[PDB]
mmCIF file of all heavy atoms in Angstrom:
data_model
loop_
_atom_site.group_PDB
_atom_site.id
_atom_site.type_symbol
_atom_site.label_atom_id
_atom_site.label_comp_id
_atom_site.label_asym_id
_atom_site.label_seq_id
_atom_site.Cartn_x
_atom_site.Cartn_y
_atom_site.Cartn_z
ATOM 1 N N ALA L 1 30.768 -23.189 -20.208
ATOM 2 C CA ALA L 1 32.132 -23.301 -20.718
ATOM 3 C C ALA L 1 32.108 -23.747 -22.113
ATOM 4 O O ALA L 1 33.023 -23.336 -22.912
ATOM 5 C CB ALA L 1 32.956 -24.285 -19.853
ATOM 6 N N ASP L 2 31.162 -24.563 -22.495
ATOM 7 C CA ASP L 2 31.065 -25.071 -23.815
ATOM 8 C C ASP L 2 29.996 -24.373 -24.681
ATOM 9 O O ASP L 2 29.565 -24.903 -25.678
ATOM 10 C CB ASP L 2 30.858 -26.597 -23.794
ATOM 11 C CG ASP L 2 29.579 -27.006 -23.100
ATOM 12 O OD1 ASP L 2 28.923 -26.126 -22.485
ATOM 13 O OD2 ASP L 2 29.213 -28.196 -23.154
ATOM 14 N N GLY L 3 29.631 -23.205 -24.204
ATOM 15 C CA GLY L 3 28.394 -22.512 -24.703
ATOM 16 C C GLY L 3 28.543 -21.769 -26.100
ATOM 17 O O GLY L 3 27.608 -21.804 -26.912
ATOM 18 N N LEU L 4 29.738 -21.196 -26.288
ATOM 19 C CA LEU L 4 29.939 -20.308 -27.487
ATOM 20 C C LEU L 4 31.203 -20.739 -28.211
ATOM 21 O O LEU L 4 32.176 -21.222 -27.670
ATOM 22 C CB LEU L 4 30.104 -18.866 -27.025
ATOM 23 C CG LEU L 4 28.983 -18.291 -26.140
ATOM 24 C CD1 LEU L 4 29.409 -16.901 -25.647
ATOM 25 C CD2 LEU L 4 27.631 -18.277 -26.839
ATOM 26 N N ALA L 5 31.103 -20.486 -29.500
ATOM 27 C CA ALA L 5 32.263 -20.703 -30.441
ATOM 28 C C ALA L 5 32.391 -19.406 -31.284
ATOM 29 O O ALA L 5 31.395 -19.026 -31.935
ATOM 30 C CB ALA L 5 32.002 -21.909 -31.361
ATOM 31 N N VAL L 6 33.582 -18.820 -31.310
ATOM 32 C CA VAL L 6 33.790 -17.555 -32.089
ATOM 33 C C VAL L 6 34.972 -17.782 -33.033
ATOM 34 O O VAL L 6 36.046 -18.182 -32.563
ATOM 35 C CB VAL L 6 33.997 -16.382 -31.181
ATOM 36 C CG1 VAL L 6 34.058 -15.150 -32.038
ATOM 37 C CG2 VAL L 6 32.739 -16.202 -30.267
ATOM 38 N N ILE L 7 34.688 -17.573 -34.291
ATOM 39 C CA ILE L 7 35.777 -17.583 -35.353
ATOM 40 C C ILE L 7 36.318 -16.150 -35.285
ATOM 41 O O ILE L 7 35.558 -15.159 -35.492
ATOM 42 C CB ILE L 7 35.288 -17.901 -36.702
ATOM 43 C CG1 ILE L 7 34.671 -19.354 -36.731
ATOM 44 C CG2 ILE L 7 36.446 -17.871 -37.767
ATOM 45 C CD1 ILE L 7 33.982 -19.667 -38.020
ATOM 46 N N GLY L 8 37.605 -16.003 -35.145
ATOM 47 C CA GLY L 8 38.327 -14.703 -35.253
ATOM 48 C C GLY L 8 39.158 -14.696 -36.467
ATOM 49 O O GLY L 8 39.922 -15.657 -36.791
ATOM 50 N N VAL L 9 39.035 -13.656 -37.281
ATOM 51 C CA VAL L 9 39.839 -13.436 -38.572
ATOM 52 C C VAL L 9 40.552 -12.179 -38.441
ATOM 53 O O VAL L 9 39.974 -11.036 -38.212
ATOM 54 C CB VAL L 9 39.020 -13.432 -39.795
ATOM 55 C CG1 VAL L 9 39.919 -13.332 -41.051
ATOM 56 C CG2 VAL L 9 38.072 -14.596 -39.861
ATOM 57 N N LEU L 10 41.884 -12.152 -38.458
ATOM 58 C CA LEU L 10 42.721 -10.939 -38.366
ATOM 59 C C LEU L 10 42.612 -10.230 -39.721
ATOM 60 O O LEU L 10 42.544 -10.842 -40.784
ATOM 61 C CB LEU L 10 44.196 -11.407 -38.141
ATOM 62 C CG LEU L 10 44.289 -12.072 -36.787
ATOM 63 C CD1 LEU L 10 45.616 -12.829 -36.698
ATOM 64 C CD2 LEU L 10 44.210 -11.001 -35.659
ATOM 65 N N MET L 11 42.462 -8.914 -39.607
ATOM 66 C CA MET L 11 42.298 -8.071 -40.793
ATOM 67 C C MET L 11 43.495 -7.127 -40.965
ATOM 68 O O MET L 11 43.876 -6.397 -40.074
ATOM 69 C CB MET L 11 40.990 -7.246 -40.658
ATOM 70 C CG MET L 11 39.800 -8.206 -40.598
ATOM 71 S SD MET L 11 38.245 -7.325 -40.233
ATOM 72 C CE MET L 11 38.026 -6.391 -41.745
ATOM 73 N N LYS L 12 44.174 -7.376 -42.122
ATOM 74 C CA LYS L 12 45.489 -6.699 -42.380
ATOM 75 C C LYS L 12 45.290 -5.515 -43.394
ATOM 76 O O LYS L 12 44.739 -5.766 -44.443
ATOM 77 C CB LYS L 12 46.339 -7.797 -42.999
ATOM 78 C CG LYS L 12 47.720 -7.280 -43.305
ATOM 79 C CD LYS L 12 48.429 -8.432 -44.091
ATOM 80 C CE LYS L 12 49.906 -8.132 -44.050
ATOM 81 N NZ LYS L 12 50.347 -6.870 -44.656
ATOM 82 N N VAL L 13 45.740 -4.332 -42.953
ATOM 83 C CA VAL L 13 45.534 -3.201 -43.834
ATOM 84 C C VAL L 13 46.237 -3.403 -45.201
ATOM 85 O O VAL L 13 47.421 -3.894 -45.159
ATOM 86 C CB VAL L 13 45.869 -1.923 -43.117
ATOM 87 C CG1 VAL L 13 47.335 -1.757 -42.761
ATOM 88 C CG2 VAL L 13 45.411 -0.697 -43.968
ATOM 89 N N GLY L 14 45.593 -3.112 -46.270
ATOM 90 C CA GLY L 14 46.167 -3.355 -47.588
ATOM 91 C C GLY L 14 45.108 -3.050 -48.592
ATOM 92 O O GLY L 14 44.382 -1.967 -48.517
ATOM 93 N N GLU L 15 44.874 -3.917 -49.526
ATOM 94 C CA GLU L 15 43.913 -3.636 -50.619
ATOM 95 C C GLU L 15 42.503 -3.634 -50.065
ATOM 96 O O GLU L 15 42.146 -4.395 -49.161
ATOM 97 C CB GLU L 15 44.013 -4.653 -51.745
ATOM 98 C CG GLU L 15 45.358 -4.635 -52.545
ATOM 99 C CD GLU L 15 45.606 -3.346 -53.286
ATOM 100 O OE1 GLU L 15 44.811 -3.010 -54.205
ATOM 101 O OE2 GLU L 15 46.615 -2.660 -52.967
ATOM 102 N N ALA L 16 41.607 -2.857 -50.672
ATOM 103 C CA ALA L 16 40.171 -2.887 -50.290
ATOM 104 C C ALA L 16 39.665 -4.254 -50.473
ATOM 105 O O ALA L 16 40.008 -4.990 -51.384
ATOM 106 C CB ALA L 16 39.438 -1.929 -51.236
ATOM 107 N N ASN L 17 38.777 -4.674 -49.539
ATOM 108 C CA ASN L 17 38.152 -5.976 -49.568
ATOM 109 C C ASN L 17 36.734 -5.840 -50.086
ATOM 110 O O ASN L 17 35.876 -5.304 -49.327
ATOM 111 C CB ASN L 17 38.256 -6.542 -48.173
ATOM 112 C CG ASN L 17 37.716 -7.949 -48.097
ATOM 113 O OD1 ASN L 17 36.952 -8.408 -48.936
ATOM 114 N ND2 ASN L 17 38.095 -8.648 -47.029
ATOM 115 N N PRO L 18 36.418 -6.293 -51.274
ATOM 116 C CA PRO L 18 35.068 -6.023 -51.807
ATOM 117 C C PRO L 18 34.010 -6.848 -51.092
ATOM 118 O O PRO L 18 32.808 -6.481 -51.138
ATOM 119 C CB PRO L 18 35.172 -6.486 -53.298
ATOM 120 C CG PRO L 18 36.243 -7.496 -53.297
ATOM 121 C CD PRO L 18 37.271 -6.950 -52.328
ATOM 122 N N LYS L 19 34.421 -7.863 -50.320
ATOM 123 C CA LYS L 19 33.399 -8.706 -49.657
ATOM 124 C C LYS L 19 32.818 -7.927 -48.477
ATOM 125 O O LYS L 19 31.803 -8.326 -47.971
ATOM 126 C CB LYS L 19 33.967 -10.014 -49.122
ATOM 127 C CG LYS L 19 34.874 -10.755 -50.071
ATOM 128 C CD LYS L 19 34.182 -11.767 -50.869
ATOM 129 C CE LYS L 19 35.198 -12.786 -51.415
ATOM 130 N NZ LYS L 19 35.415 -13.864 -50.377
ATOM 131 N N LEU L 20 33.422 -6.863 -48.027
ATOM 132 C CA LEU L 20 32.898 -5.968 -46.983
ATOM 133 C C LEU L 20 31.795 -5.031 -47.472
ATOM 134 O O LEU L 20 31.271 -4.289 -46.658
ATOM 135 C CB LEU L 20 33.998 -5.166 -46.355
ATOM 136 C CG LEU L 20 35.064 -5.975 -45.642
ATOM 137 C CD1 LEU L 20 36.163 -5.024 -45.098
ATOM 138 C CD2 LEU L 20 34.392 -6.771 -44.496
ATOM 139 N N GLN L 21 31.517 -4.989 -48.780
ATOM 140 C CA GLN L 21 30.753 -3.847 -49.307
ATOM 141 C C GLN L 21 29.341 -3.762 -48.784
ATOM 142 O O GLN L 21 28.920 -2.676 -48.500
ATOM 143 C CB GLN L 21 30.712 -3.932 -50.847
ATOM 144 C CG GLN L 21 30.281 -2.604 -51.529
ATOM 145 C CD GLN L 21 31.301 -1.557 -51.234
ATOM 146 O OE1 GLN L 21 32.490 -1.803 -51.436
ATOM 147 N NE2 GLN L 21 30.906 -0.435 -50.614
ATOM 148 N N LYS L 22 28.665 -4.864 -48.588
ATOM 149 C CA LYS L 22 27.234 -4.747 -48.115
ATOM 150 C C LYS L 22 27.288 -4.221 -46.726
ATOM 151 O O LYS L 22 26.482 -3.359 -46.329
ATOM 152 C CB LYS L 22 26.559 -6.114 -48.181
ATOM 153 C CG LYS L 22 25.043 -5.997 -47.759
ATOM 154 C CD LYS L 22 24.421 -7.398 -47.523
ATOM 155 C CE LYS L 22 23.024 -7.286 -46.870
ATOM 156 N NZ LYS L 22 22.056 -7.006 -48.003
ATOM 157 N N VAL L 23 28.215 -4.682 -45.863
ATOM 158 C CA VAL L 23 28.360 -4.209 -44.529
ATOM 159 C C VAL L 23 28.659 -2.759 -44.516
ATOM 160 O O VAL L 23 27.999 -1.963 -43.787
ATOM 161 C CB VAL L 23 29.471 -5.009 -43.767
ATOM 162 C CG1 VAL L 23 29.792 -4.312 -42.460
ATOM 163 C CG2 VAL L 23 29.073 -6.460 -43.566
ATOM 164 N N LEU L 24 29.656 -2.307 -45.297
ATOM 165 C CA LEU L 24 30.029 -0.871 -45.234
ATOM 166 C C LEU L 24 28.954 0.011 -45.763
ATOM 167 O O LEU L 24 28.763 1.041 -45.172
ATOM 168 C CB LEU L 24 31.256 -0.748 -46.171
ATOM 169 C CG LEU L 24 32.465 -1.454 -45.531
ATOM 170 C CD1 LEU L 24 33.655 -1.481 -46.517
ATOM 171 C CD2 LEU L 24 32.852 -0.850 -44.204
ATOM 172 N N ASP L 25 28.263 -0.424 -46.781
ATOM 173 C CA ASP L 25 27.153 0.337 -47.394
ATOM 174 C C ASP L 25 26.050 0.489 -46.383
ATOM 175 O O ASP L 25 25.292 1.416 -46.495
ATOM 176 C CB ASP L 25 26.587 -0.256 -48.669
ATOM 177 C CG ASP L 25 27.527 -0.060 -49.868
ATOM 178 O OD1 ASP L 25 28.479 0.713 -49.771
ATOM 179 O OD2 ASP L 25 27.302 -0.715 -50.869
ATOM 180 N N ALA L 26 25.886 -0.446 -45.473
ATOM 181 C CA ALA L 26 24.791 -0.404 -44.508
ATOM 182 C C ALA L 26 25.046 0.541 -43.419
ATOM 183 O O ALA L 26 24.088 0.995 -42.671
ATOM 184 C CB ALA L 26 24.535 -1.829 -43.949
ATOM 185 N N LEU L 27 26.255 1.001 -43.146
ATOM 186 C CA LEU L 27 26.548 1.771 -41.953
ATOM 187 C C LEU L 27 25.884 3.185 -42.020
ATOM 188 O O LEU L 27 25.627 3.713 -40.963
ATOM 189 C CB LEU L 27 28.063 1.931 -41.749
ATOM 190 C CG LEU L 27 28.846 0.613 -41.611
ATOM 191 C CD1 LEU L 27 30.298 1.022 -41.350
ATOM 192 C CD2 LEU L 27 28.322 -0.083 -40.383
ATOM 193 N N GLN L 28 25.664 3.713 -43.233
ATOM 194 C CA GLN L 28 25.036 5.074 -43.298
ATOM 195 C C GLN L 28 23.653 5.043 -42.702
ATOM 196 O O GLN L 28 23.200 6.091 -42.265
ATOM 197 C CB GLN L 28 24.993 5.587 -44.728
ATOM 198 C CG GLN L 28 24.541 4.610 -45.777
ATOM 199 C CD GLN L 28 23.091 4.271 -45.676
ATOM 200 O OE1 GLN L 28 22.226 5.166 -45.414
ATOM 201 N NE2 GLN L 28 22.749 2.916 -45.840
ATOM 202 N N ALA L 29 23.052 3.866 -42.527
ATOM 203 C CA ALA L 29 21.710 3.759 -41.863
ATOM 204 C C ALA L 29 21.698 3.605 -40.430
ATOM 205 O O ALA L 29 20.619 3.614 -39.785
ATOM 206 C CB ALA L 29 20.893 2.640 -42.503
ATOM 207 N N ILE L 30 22.853 3.344 -39.816
ATOM 208 C CA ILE L 30 22.987 3.073 -38.425
ATOM 209 C C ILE L 30 24.106 3.899 -37.778
ATOM 210 O O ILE L 30 24.867 3.517 -36.953
ATOM 211 C CB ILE L 30 23.209 1.555 -38.079
ATOM 212 C CG1 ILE L 30 24.538 1.035 -38.728
ATOM 213 C CG2 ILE L 30 21.961 0.730 -38.526
ATOM 214 C CD1 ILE L 30 25.148 -0.001 -37.817
ATOM 215 N N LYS L 31 24.173 5.214 -38.207
ATOM 216 C CA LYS L 31 25.243 6.020 -37.731
ATOM 217 C C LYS L 31 25.479 6.294 -36.346
ATOM 218 O O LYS L 31 26.577 6.410 -35.803
ATOM 219 C CB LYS L 31 25.229 7.356 -38.537
ATOM 220 C CG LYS L 31 25.854 7.340 -39.952
ATOM 221 C CD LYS L 31 27.354 7.131 -39.864
ATOM 222 C CE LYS L 31 28.184 7.409 -41.108
ATOM 223 N NZ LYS L 31 29.620 7.258 -40.640
ATOM 224 N N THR L 32 24.312 6.360 -35.646
ATOM 225 C CA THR L 32 24.318 6.690 -34.205
ATOM 226 C C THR L 32 23.788 5.538 -33.296
ATOM 227 O O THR L 32 23.015 4.717 -33.828
ATOM 228 C CB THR L 32 23.526 8.046 -33.920
ATOM 229 O OG1 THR L 32 22.282 7.931 -34.563
ATOM 230 C CG2 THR L 32 24.362 9.230 -34.593
ATOM 231 N N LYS L 33 24.118 5.652 -32.084
ATOM 232 C CA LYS L 33 23.811 4.628 -31.067
ATOM 233 C C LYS L 33 22.314 4.291 -31.066
ATOM 234 O O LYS L 33 21.407 5.190 -31.030
ATOM 235 C CB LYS L 33 24.280 5.041 -29.751
ATOM 236 C CG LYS L 33 23.996 3.916 -28.700
ATOM 237 C CD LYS L 33 24.621 4.319 -27.431
ATOM 238 C CE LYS L 33 24.349 3.334 -26.295
ATOM 239 N NZ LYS L 33 25.262 3.699 -25.175
ATOM 240 N N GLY L 34 21.998 3.013 -31.141
ATOM 241 C CA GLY L 34 20.581 2.525 -31.226
ATOM 242 C C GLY L 34 19.939 2.437 -32.550
ATOM 243 O O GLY L 34 18.858 1.770 -32.665
ATOM 244 N N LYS L 35 20.461 3.042 -33.652
ATOM 245 C CA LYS L 35 19.879 2.877 -34.917
ATOM 246 C C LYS L 35 20.040 1.412 -35.362
ATOM 247 O O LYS L 35 21.097 0.756 -34.996
ATOM 248 C CB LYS L 35 20.405 3.839 -35.950
ATOM 249 C CG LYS L 35 19.982 5.296 -35.644
ATOM 250 C CD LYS L 35 20.109 6.156 -36.882
ATOM 251 C CE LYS L 35 19.064 5.916 -37.988
ATOM 252 N NZ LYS L 35 19.288 6.620 -39.267
ATOM 253 N N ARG L 36 19.124 1.002 -36.235
ATOM 254 C CA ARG L 36 19.036 -0.384 -36.697
ATOM 255 C C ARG L 36 18.355 -0.508 -37.983
ATOM 256 O O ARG L 36 17.540 0.427 -38.396
ATOM 257 C CB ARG L 36 18.480 -1.248 -35.624
ATOM 258 C CG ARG L 36 16.991 -1.014 -35.451
ATOM 259 C CD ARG L 36 16.634 -1.657 -34.143
ATOM 260 N NE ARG L 36 17.398 -1.053 -33.047
ATOM 261 C CZ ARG L 36 17.100 -1.198 -31.757
ATOM 262 N NH1 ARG L 36 16.028 -1.907 -31.414
ATOM 263 N NH2 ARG L 36 17.847 -0.605 -30.829
#
């Protein structure tokens, strides 16, 4: 019951968020199920 803590941040459509860029840039390497 006391095992996990999760921060949730609601994401509101609007201006591009540049702090996402490393994450989004990385997705072309993991396009399909199981890639890493």
